[PDB]
Design a protein around this ligand. Structure first.
Ligand code: SF4
Ligand SMILES: [Zn+2]
Ligand SMILES: [Zn+2]
Ligand SMILES: [Zn+2]
Lengths: 732, 385, 433
């Protein structure tokens, strides 16, 4: 049951956390330190609960947010697999399925090295279940997707795989035995005992990625770092719509008509046999990988699509419905570009004036979009991809709009002119994204190492039997140095009151507080800016005015790019440029997606400097409806979460650089807003012993010697730090 | 706020047990602040005839004060003491003073044992600008190529004085691990008030011991920790042969004053540029010059002078320990077995074998100056066999 | 080799008399003198501000790039050279075009005046400098693809093609993105400029020793803060075993040295009937006898008045108070007998000891017949006549007088002998053909 040595008196602090949340079917919220082996904590009891068929049933789904750390989950549990294996004697059967289908897919050299995921998987599925489903037999055109047919053979058969594999592990099996990550996964979902994949993949309302069978008997799912659920769920149902998209769609309108015109009865009587079968008994035509190229369920919590074949009986008639839609939709676009308008169910009502038959052909469209292409089975998917966007949209507008939100954003965001207007359909109820989750599941546990206010689980608007505050001791001398700055000499103004471009007199001493941090602190630092143009504003005075003149002389600097390609470059450098004779401080952005998937180690990355209040500051009026609805839920929330949204991202970013529990961390706080907000947002285990013991308005020049006093002591005398042997009560 | 808060720090620490006996326990905590790490020795195996390499970071880190007016002033002054106390303890060795300054490395004093040459070099090293950045790669380059030509029957250790800065040097010093791991050369650094992970990985990949400077007292401790010839990695050597026993010469043996001076550019010996009258004599060159218990340049063997250097470590290993009791077994007439006094600060120091009573000033005098209990004498040598 | 013998006049003064007194050749001079300092003494001109410069100078190349309109050309590297020592192809076009294209001095500012500020499009010299660095980053792009682990460019891409989104997350900039078009253009180039300066490590990391492993992710990464690996393991009884046998040998042979043994047992044997104890009986009787005799101190009142035993006690005092007849003035020809041999023969003799130590060295291994090289077995033969002849005229120059000569030649014949010892001992191990 892997106690395995001194485990910084925590598994016992989490032992009863399982036994309360699982034996009593507790939904459950965990605080966790950032320096706590996040599965070594959790899975060691979870896999202990795996064998404990405590009545009969123990499922496991797990998700996290980044595919390298997904494999890092897998990585040491293989020894945990091996750990008790020798100890309990023999070895029982197991499976943990890393189910990737986005990147890791194809072993054919013609298909593989084209860069993006979705379009190339469209080429794959167009080849498999659109070319070799339409043109079944053949030699040349039919292409050699041979191990799909090997899946046919061993899907008729019964093998038994070994333990947990990875994306690449099956690819050598792809070049030997393990077949397709999708198929070699569909057959393994049949008897899966543990699934790990992305937090995003479950939470796709666009294509409803139903992972298991809907079996809520004991559906046992585990959640780590589940911080920005809104930024998942609302963005999971967020619908962007380009004018360039529509005109391309306008161009393949009559393009598809030419396919209709050239086909007289060949694909048309194929429809006629089965469109009659659509009327007679409703059944989807395909159960294979075609559904992957298909909106599984745009609006999942519905009863059924009972009266399909909506007010539309023919195909060009159905095509005219989109002519009735799109051409009206640009009429619902182009005039509307003068005023931002937030009217979600009023739009569909005024649409009902314009659309002749509504609310059934709005909801029964995206399949009849697809199915009238399914009798074709011709059009390449990336060509058809901006169209599937559209029949997704009014389908979403058809069903869930009165609780949700329509926003129209034509004006200046990377367009200085009006050259690309856009609108968006957001949802608002991440609850209603996670209510079907909860109804499909048993009682499933969030763990977030940043979540200090427990009051934001009712921002998820849900119920909780178990929600406490995890308190761990530190006989490791001192876990960390949290250091709120508040300079008095250079007069702290670190919140953007006079904003990131309103004055540079604020900015005259962020270099000073950094270079001295650079001068003292060795061994690589990853700091967090607010945004890319903020970052662009950050270094804007830094070149022309004299700033780097000692900064490059002390360590070096790793610019992270708006483009993720060049952003991954310095990364290749930073893991290297620290581990050689160079400190090489990396420079980065909190809210940007450089802030996940890393888990910095004492090897490289052991200090973080705050820069400003880490709040949104960018997207207009996505607030107000989201604001007023929680004001329709709890009514004093303007002040409230608009603190915590910064805070929930802060230690999400900031509290990262320690892994085990001796790994160090200098998480200083250059901030003007600290009085309650930083204190509310910091962990109750972390405000208590460490944050502002007697160090609040710590001018950097004074705070210089603090880290000096910190590290110099903390570097030496380590042997014994909270050593546990046998069980001696202690009772916390 | 802070005008009170600046003095909330002072007010309580000023305050103590009031009424009577004030500012008393504050002095007791200062004595309770004392008594840091004693020895924690007891080792075996290796440590013999070291060949040390002083490596000095000369950088802009020296300009910070932090202990002294210069960090070299913290460094350089006690190195002379470290030189002298080394030559006190370990005369069977020699030390390479190599200085890094401006991204290069200057082997300042060669690998040798002549103390005055080393000390005046430090006295020359006073007015060093320490311009430029540290480069260890140039330092290890000298360290390789010099010790490359040393035998494998030599102890191969390097003492780096690093100012904790960026290790500013190219050319895959991470690959100098396998260079020097194979070369069986040990490398020990201590960081000046901070840590370098790569250098910390270097020493932990070495077997050399890394530390961080805490204070000037603490600076002395690790020097003192590295005075002793440490048990380095196994499979270095066993033996070292043609240890030349010399002769002193009086130059008055048979022919009284037949030579006005025994250094006239033809005599066997007379190595260094100075006049001499005959004091010494080596076996193999038959080299007569100024007396030196080290080695020579023509016979090229080791001028061993046994009572000095074959005596120094010859009792530096075989030590034992005492014990402490606060009790009162009043052995003597409330006396000490050594100095014969009493204060009774409950540290009645009893030997492990002969079990004799000592004080701190008798324990320190053993454990720093005498290095053995003489109570074992009269107790070992009488039944010895 | 010749700049070595000219810049150093002391070694040249050593190198003179091998040509002046014709001791050895230059071929023999560089055959047995240097041989080690080819790595040590030549370690100055190669390093020179740490060559294979990757991360030493790169910290200081940007702050020290400009003092003034002509603040350049310090020494060798001064402030321009290691800029060339990193960029390969930029260094190539330099000798191609300086001063082949323009004036050499007019290169150092005009090529670096406009490239320093924002952007350099005035001439194809700085333009091809500017145009290649985009290809360099394009070239640097391909190398980062080959590593491809712990790189969330992979992990980010899986979440944006899937809904066809995160193009709005790019296109959502606040704060007046309408009418400036200045620093938007500028800063990304400075982003690009310092990423060049960042990849200038990468542009010089290949210079180190080509530095390649490119990271196949090594799928273990076992978080080991626990475990107690405890890297060093001494104390498996190594000097415990020495102490058990050497003090045992210091027990059974306690100081078998010069006076340390031979006087020791000889007087222990003189103690004689000590196991018989008849001498010890009389001892313990004499312990009991003068037991009382000390304490009374009437016998030890007058154990002083023997002026009979004062005169002899005064005598060897006065005898050792005046030693006489031992050449009080022992020097006073030594100044002439210093400056004449310490003009050449201090260095001349040193010519031997740079060689004769190696002459001891090859014979220090020769009967093993391993270090038996033709390079060495005739180097035995080579310098043998090259030294033992060239001393004979310095020997014969000082036998101008007789007792002025015969004192010092008692001490020089070792040089003749240690030569002939080696030669004499050479055939004690008779070498075959
Ligand atoms: S099915 Fe398996 S092989 Fe065939 S395309 Fe998709 S990946 Fe490539
Ligand atoms: Zn000799
Ligand atoms: Zn005592
Ligand atoms: Zn004793």
């Amino acid at each position: 049951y892997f106690p395995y040595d001194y485990i910084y008196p925590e598994q016992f602090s989490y032992m009863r956390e399982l036994k309360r949340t699982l034996d009593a079917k507790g939904h459950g919220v965990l605080e966790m330190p950032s320096g706590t082996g996040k599965t070594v904590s959790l899975l060691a009891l979870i896999m202990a609960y795996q064998r404990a068929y405590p009545l009969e049933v123990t499922k496991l789904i797990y998700c996290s947010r980044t595919v390298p750390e997904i494999e890092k989950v897998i990585e040491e549990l293989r020894k945990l697999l091996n750990f008790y294996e020798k100890q309990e004697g023999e070895k029982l059967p197991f499976l943990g399925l890393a189910l990737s289908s986005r990147k890791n897919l194809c072993i054919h050299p013609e298909v593989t090295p084209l860069r993006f995921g979705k379009d190339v998987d469209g080429k794959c599925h167009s080849l498999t279940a659109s070319y070799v489903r339409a043109q079944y037999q053949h030699d040349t055109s039919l292409p050699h997707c041979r191990f799909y047919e090997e899946f046919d053979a061993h899907g008729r058969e019964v093998p038994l795989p070994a333990g947990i594999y990875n994306l690449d592990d099956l690819k050598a099996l792809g070049r030997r035995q393990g077949w397709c990550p999708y198929f070699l996964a569909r057959y393994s979902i049949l008897h899966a005992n543990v699934v790990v994949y992305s937090y995003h993949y479950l939470l796709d309302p666009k294509i409803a990625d139903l992972v298991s069978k809907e079996l809520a008997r004991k559906a046992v799912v585990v959640f780590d770092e589940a911080h920005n659920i809104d930024n998942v769920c609302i963005d999971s149902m967020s619908v962007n719509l380009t004018r360039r998209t529509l005109d391309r769609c306008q161009g393949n309108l009559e393009t598809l008509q030419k396919t209709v015109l050239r086909i007289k009865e060949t694909d048309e009587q194929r429809l006629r046999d089965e469109y009659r079968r659509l009327v007679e008994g409703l059944r989807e035509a395909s159960a294979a990988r075609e559904t992957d190229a298909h909106l599984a369920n745009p609006v999942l919590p519905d009863e059924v699509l009972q009266e399909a074949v909506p007010g539309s009986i023919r195909t060009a008639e159905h095509f005219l419905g989109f002519l009735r839609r799109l051409l009206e939709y640009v009429k619902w676009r182009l005039r509307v570009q003068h005023v931002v308008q937030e009217s979600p169910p009023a739009f569909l009502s005024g649409l009902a004036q314009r659309v002749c038959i509504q609310r059934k052909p709005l909801r029964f469209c995206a399949e009849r979009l697809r199915s009238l292409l399914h009798t074709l089975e011709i059009t390449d998917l990336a060509d058809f991809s901006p169209l599937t966007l559209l029949a997704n949209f009014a389908t979403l507008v058809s069903t869930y709009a009165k609780g949700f939100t329509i926003i129209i954003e034509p004006f200046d965001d990377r367009t200085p002119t009006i050259a690309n207007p856009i609108l968006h359909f957001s949802c608002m109820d991440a609850s209603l994204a996670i209510k079907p989750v909860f109804e499909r599941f048993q009682s499933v546990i969030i763990t977030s190492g940043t979540l200090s206010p427990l009051d934001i689980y009712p921002k998820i608007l849900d119920f909780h039997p178990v929600t406490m505050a995890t308190f761990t001791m530190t006989l490791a001398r001192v876990c960390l140095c949290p250091m709120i700055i508040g300079r008095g000499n250079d007069q702290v103004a670190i919140s953007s009151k006079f904003e990131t471009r309103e004055d540079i007199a604020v900015i005259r001493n962020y270099g000073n507080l950094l270079l001295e941090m650079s001068a003292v602190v060795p061994d690589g630092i990853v700091a967090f800016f607010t945004s890319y143009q903020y970052m662009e504003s950050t270094v804007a005075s830094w070149y022309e005015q004299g700033i780097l003149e000692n900064i490059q002389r002390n360590k070096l600097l790793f610019i992270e790019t708006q483009d993720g390609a060049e952003t991954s470059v310095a990364l290749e450098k930073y893991q290297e440029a620290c581990e050689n004779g160079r400190g090489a401080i990396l420079l980065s952005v909190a809210r940007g997606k450089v802030s996940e998937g890393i888990d910095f180690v004492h090897h490289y990355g052991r200090a973080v400097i705050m820069f400003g209040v880490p709040y949104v500051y960018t997207q207009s009026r996505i607030l107000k409806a989201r604001l007023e609805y929680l004001r329709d839920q709890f009514q004093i929330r303007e002040n409230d979460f608009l603190t915590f949204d910064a805070m929930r991202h802060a230690a999400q970013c900031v509290g990262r650089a320690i892994r085990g529990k001796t790994d160090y961390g200098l998480m200083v706080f250059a901030d003007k807003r600290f009085a309650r907000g930083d204190k509310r947002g910091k962990l109750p285990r972390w405000i208590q012993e460490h944050l502002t013991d007697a160090n609040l308005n710590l001018t950097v020049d004074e705070g210089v010697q603090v880290a000096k006093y910190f590290l110099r002591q903390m570097a030496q005398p380590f042997h014994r730090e909270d050593q546990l042997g046998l069980s001696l009560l202690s009772l916390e | 706020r802070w005008e009170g808060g600046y003095e909330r720090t002072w007010e309580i620490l000023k305050e103590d047990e009031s009424g009577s006996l004030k500012a008393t326990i504050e002095d007791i905590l200062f004595k309770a602040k004392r008594k840091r790490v004693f020895e924690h020795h007891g080792q075996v195996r290796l440590g013999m005839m070291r060949h040390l390499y002083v490596v000095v970071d000369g950088s802009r880190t020296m300009e910070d004060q932090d202990l002294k007016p210069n960090r070299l002033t913290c460094t350089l002054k006690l190195l002379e003491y470290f030189v002298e106390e080394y030559f006190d303890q370990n005369p069977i060795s020699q030390i390479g003073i190599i200085v890094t300054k401006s991204k290069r490395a200057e082997k300042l004093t060669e690998l040798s044992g002549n103390p005055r040459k080393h000390i005046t070099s430090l006295k020359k090293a006073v007015d060093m600008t320490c311009h430029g950045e540290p480069s260890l790669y140039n330092s290890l380059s000298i360290a390789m190529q010099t010790l490359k030509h040393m035998p494998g029957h030599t102890s191969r250790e390097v003492l780096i004085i690093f100012s904790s800065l960026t290790t500013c040097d190219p050319s895959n010093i991470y690959d100098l691990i396998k260079t020097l791991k194979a070369a069986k050369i040990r490398v020990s650094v201590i960081g000046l008030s901070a840590e370098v992970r790569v250098c910390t990985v270097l020493a932990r990949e070495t077997g050399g011991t890394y530390h961080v400077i805490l204070d000037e007292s603490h600076y002395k401790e690790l020097l003192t920790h590295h005075v002793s010839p440490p048990p380095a990695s196994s499979s270095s050597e066993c033996s070292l042969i043609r240890m030349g026993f010399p002769q002193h010469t009086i130059a008055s043996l048979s022919d009284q004053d037949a030579k006005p001076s025994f250094s006239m550019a033809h005599l066997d010996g007379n190595t260094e540029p100075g006049l001499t009258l005959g004091g010494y004599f080596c076996p193999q060159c038959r080299a007569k010059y100024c007396e030196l218990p080290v080695e020579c340049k023509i016979c090229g063997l080791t001028l061993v002078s046994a009572p000095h250097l074959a005596r120094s470590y010859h009792h530096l290993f075989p030590l034992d320990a005492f014990q402490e009791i606060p009790l009162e077994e009043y052995n003597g007439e409330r006396f000490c077995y050594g100095c014969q006094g009493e204060l009774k600060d409950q540290h009645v120091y009893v030997c492990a074998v002969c079990q004799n009573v000592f004080c701190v000033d008798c324990d320190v005098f053993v454990h720093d100056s005498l290095h053995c209990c003489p109570g074992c004498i009269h107790k070992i040598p009488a039944p010895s066999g | 080799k010749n700049r070595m013998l000219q810049e150093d006049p002391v070694l040249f003064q050593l190198y003179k008399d091998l040509v002046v007194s014709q001791v050895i050749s230059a071929e023999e001079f560089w055959a047995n003198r240097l041989n080690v300092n080819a790595t040590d003494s030549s370690s100055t001109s190669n390093h020179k501000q740490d060559v294979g410069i990757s991360a030493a100078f790169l910290a200081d190349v940007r702050p020290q790039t400009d003092g003034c309109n002509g603040l350049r050309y310090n020494l060798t590297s001064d402030i321009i050279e290691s800029i060339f020592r990193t960029y390969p192809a930029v260094k190539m076009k330099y000798a191609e075009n300086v001063p082949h294209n323009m004036t050499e001095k007019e290169f150092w500012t005009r090529f670096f005046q406009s490239h320093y500020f924002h952007r350099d499009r005035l001439n194809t010299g700085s333009k091809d400098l500017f145009a290649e660095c985009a290809k360099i980053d394009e070239k640097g792009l391909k190398t980062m693809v080959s590593l491809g682990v712990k790189n969330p460019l992979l992990d980010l891409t899986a979440l944006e093609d899937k809904p066809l989104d995160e193009g709005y997350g790019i296109s959502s900039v606040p704060s007046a993105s309408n009418s400036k078009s200045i620093k938007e253009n500028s800063n990304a180039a400075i982003i690009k400029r310092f990423n060049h300066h960042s990849a200038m490590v990468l542009a010089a990391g290949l210079r180190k020793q080509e530095a390649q492993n490119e990271q196949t992710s090594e799928p273990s990464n076992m978080d080991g803060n626990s475990g107690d690996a405890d890297c060093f393991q001494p104390a498996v009884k190594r000097a415990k075993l020495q102490e058990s046998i050497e003090y045992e040998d210091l027990g059974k042979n306690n100081s078998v040295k010069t006076i340390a043994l031979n006087l020791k047992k000889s007087d222990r044997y003189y103690h004689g009937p000590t196991p018989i104890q008849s001498l010890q009986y009389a001892t313990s009787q004499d312990i009991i006898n003068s037991f009382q005799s000390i304490r009374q101190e009437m016998e030890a009142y007058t154990p002083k008045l023997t002026q009979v035993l004062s005169s002899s006690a005064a005598s060897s005092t006065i005898t050792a108070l005046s030693p006489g007849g031992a050449l009080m003035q022992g020097g006073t020809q030594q100044a002439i007998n210093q400056m004449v041999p310490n003009d050449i023969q201090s260095e001349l003799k040193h010519l031997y000891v740079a060689v004769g130590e190696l002459l001891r060295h090859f014979w220090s291994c020769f009967p093993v017949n391993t270090p038996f090289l033709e390079e060495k077995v005739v180097k035995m033969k080579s310098n043998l006549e090259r030294f033992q002849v060239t001393k004979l005229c310095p020997f014969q120059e000082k036998i101008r007088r007789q007792y002025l000569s015969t004192n010092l030649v008692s001490h020089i014949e070792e040089m003749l002998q240690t030569a002939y010892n080696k030669l004499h001992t050479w055939q004690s191990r008779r070498l075959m053909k």
